[PDB]
Amino acid sequence: QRSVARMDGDVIIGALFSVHHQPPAEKVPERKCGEIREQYGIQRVEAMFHTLDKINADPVLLPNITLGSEIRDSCWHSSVALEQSIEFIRDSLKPIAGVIGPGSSSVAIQVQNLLQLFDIPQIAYSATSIDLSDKTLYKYFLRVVPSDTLQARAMLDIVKRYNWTYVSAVHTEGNYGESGMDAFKELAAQEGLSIAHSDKIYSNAGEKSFDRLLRKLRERLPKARVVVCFCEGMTVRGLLSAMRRLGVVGEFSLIGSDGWADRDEVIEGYEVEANGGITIKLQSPEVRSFDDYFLKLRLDTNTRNPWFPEFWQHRFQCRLPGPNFKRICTGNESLEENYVQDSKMGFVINAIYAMAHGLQNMHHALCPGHVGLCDAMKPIDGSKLLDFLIKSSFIGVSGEEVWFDEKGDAPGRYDIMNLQYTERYDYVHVGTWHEGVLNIDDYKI
C-alpha cells in the first residue's frame, strides 16, 4: 500500500530512492519509515521524471520507443527495499525492464540478490562497495559510480608520486574501511611499498584507544610521516583529538579517503591539527538543467509525484488543511530557499541515460529496420539487455564518458584536496585522479 510514482510508456524503468528516512528503532517491524528526504529522495524522484521526459522528447535517442517509470521508496532500509522489489516482480509472479538504485551498498546487495533471480539488470548511482564487482554473486549489477577500490588506487598513486616507500595504514572497522584498505595493501605489496604501523579502529573507540593509536604512529617517525587513512570521518576526528590531548601538531602527512573528503565537521575545532591533510572525494559537478526544472515546481500542479504534498509541508514547515506545523502553506513558497542540489545528481541522471542507451542498442540488434518494439523485444529479455548495457557507452550529463567494464564497473574521477590555512582553513583543490591518471599541483601542495 506504499505510494508509487508512475509514468506510462512503452518500456518501464523501475527505481528505488530513499524518499523517506529509515524506520525509527520502534517502527522497524512494521516497516513504517522516518521523515521525508529531499536530496536523497524527492530530488531524485523528480530528476527521474524530468530525465525520462528529456529522453522521450529527444529525436536521436530511442526515437520511436517511449520510456515510463515505476519509482518506489527504499526508505534507506534493506527490509523496505526488498518489500518494494517484490512489488516490482509481483504481477509477473507492464513488467519493469531494469532498476535504478538503491543508494547504499548493503541495501543494493539485498535488492540484487532478488532482482537477479528474475534477470532484471540493476544500475546503481552511489553504491561503491568493492563486493559488488563480484559477478559470481552479483551478475545483474552494474553502476555509473566508481568502486572504492579506485580510491585505494588513487591514494597509492599519491604515495608513489612523492617516492615514499614506507607509510602507516589506518582504517575504520566495517566493509568500507576494511575492503578499501585490503585493496590498498594488496597493491602496495605488488609495487614495492612497505607498511609501518597498521591499525583497525572500531566505530565506538574511546579516547584511550585513539591515544594509543597516536603513540603507535609516532613510534615510526620520521621514517613514516605518511599515514594512509581509509577511514570514516569520525575515525579521523578521533585521531585529531588525540593529537590535541598530546599537544602535538604537524608531524604527519595524513592521506584520507572520501570518508573524510572535504567535511568541515571532521576538523571543526581541530583545524590546527588537521592542517596539511590530503583528502579525496568523488567529482560531482552540479547539473544546472536539474535546478532549472526543480526550482520551478509547484505544489498545485505537481500531480505525478505522490509524495510532493508530504514534502512541501516538511520543506516549508507548514500544513495543508484538510499535521505538526502552525503555518498554513500558500503554495507560493520558494524552493530556492536554502536550496542545495543532491551531490549525486549527475550519477542519478547518467544511470538513467545508461538504461536508455542499453535499450536502444538492444533494439538496433534485435529489431533492425523495425519502428519501435518488435516481437524479439516483447517482452524484453533481461539476460540480453544485461549484455547490451555492459557494452553501452555515451557522453554523460557533465561531459564525462560513461562506459562499463566486463564487471559492470565505472571509471573513477576524484578531486584531490589539501587542507590549508588561508587568511580561515579551507580544503584547497590541488588536482584530480581521472580514470587512472593522477594530476597534482606539487607547488600548491
Add this chain to the structure above:
Amino acid sequence: QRSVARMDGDVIIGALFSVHHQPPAEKVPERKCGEIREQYGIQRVEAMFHTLDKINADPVLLPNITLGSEIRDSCWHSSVALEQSIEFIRDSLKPIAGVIGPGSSSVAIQVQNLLQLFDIPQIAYSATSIDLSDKTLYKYFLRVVPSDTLQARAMLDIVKRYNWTYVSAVHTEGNYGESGMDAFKELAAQEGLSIAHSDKIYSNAGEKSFDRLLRKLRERLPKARVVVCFCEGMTVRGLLSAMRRLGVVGEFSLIGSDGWADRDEVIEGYEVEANGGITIKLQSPEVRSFDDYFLKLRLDTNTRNPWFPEFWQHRFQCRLPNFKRICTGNESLEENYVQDSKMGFVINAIYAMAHGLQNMHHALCPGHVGLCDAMKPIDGSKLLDFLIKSSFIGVSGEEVWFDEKGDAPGRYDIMNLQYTEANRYDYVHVGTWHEGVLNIDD
C-alpha cells in the same frame, strides 16, 4: 521446474534441505546444482516425512489437525534457497505456516530476510551464527541448535576449571572466528581472565604468516601456555605445521572450538604436535527410530520422495546415465551407512513447529476439535509468539525451549587428543558442557 517433496494436510510446513551440493562454478548463473547428498539431503527429507507421519498418528499432539509438507532443495546456496523461498510465498502473490531450515547461517540469513516480510516463522537445526540472535534484523528466526556464543562460554568454563589466569587467543578472520572470539573476550573481560597475545589469521594465509603467528605466541611464554582458538580447522592446521617447521613440540595447551572438533584432516601428519589438545563439538546422539525407518526404504515403494531414484542410482552406482549396471531395487542401504550427525536437531525443529501450532490452538481455539475460524488462516505473527514460548521433551530426552531471541540451550561434548593404550592418536571423550554445567573426568 525444480522438484518438490509434498504431503497434503490441514497445515503445511515448509522445509529447505541441501538435497544437492551447490552449483559448480560454471553452473552458478543457471542455478543448476551439484551432485545429490545423503546426510544433508535425502536423509533429512525422509526424516521429515516420517516425523510428520509420527505426529499425525499421535493422539495427544495435534489430535485432529494434520500436518502436511512442501520440502524444497536449497542446494546449499543462497541463490537457489532464495529462488525456492520465493516459491513458498508465490501462493500469497494452501499457504506455508512456517519453514524448517536451511542449513547454513549465511544461507539462513538470506531466507530469513525474505520470510519475515510474510510473517513466516523459521526454525533452524544447524545455523549457529551469533548474528541470527539479533531480533531487530531476524524477528522471525529461531533455532533448536545453540548459538556459537555458547561455545565461547563453554571454552571459558574449561579455562576456569583449570585455574588458568592468562591465555593467548587466536581466531580465523570472518564471521565464525571473529564473532566467536568477540564473545569469548567479552566474557573474559567480565570474569577476571587476562588475554596475553591476541591474533587473527585467514585459513588460506601462507606459511610466513603462520611463522609470524607462532613466533608472536612463543614470546608471551612462559606465562601464557594456553591458547584459545576460535578457529576453522585449517587455521589450527596452519599452526601445527608452523610448529614442525620450527621443531617445537608440547609447549602449548590448545583449546579449540568446533571448527576443530574431532576432525582428522586438521591433525593428520601432525598428531604429535596436536597431542593434548582440547576441543568441543555439538553433541549428536544417534536417533535409533530414524535408522529403523530409513534403512528399510525401497526404490519401488518410495514415490513421495521425488529425488529417491537419483539418490538410489548414485548411492549404489547404477542406472534405471553414468554407470553400466542396472539397479535391481534390492541393494541394501546399510552398507557404509552413517546417520546425519544433525538428525536429532532436524527432528526437534519439526516437533517445535508442531508444538507451536498446538499451543496456538489451545489459546485461540480453546475446546475446539481441529482448526477453528481463528486459525483460518494461521496468523504468522501470532504463531511466532507461541513458538517462542513452547517447550517440550525432544527426540533424545532433552528439554527443548527458546529464550526471547529464539535461541536454544547448548550441549557440547568435550574432547582431548591422546596417545591411546594402543599406538594410535585418538580424540577421547573427556566430558560434557550441559546447559551451563561443565563436567569433566580425569
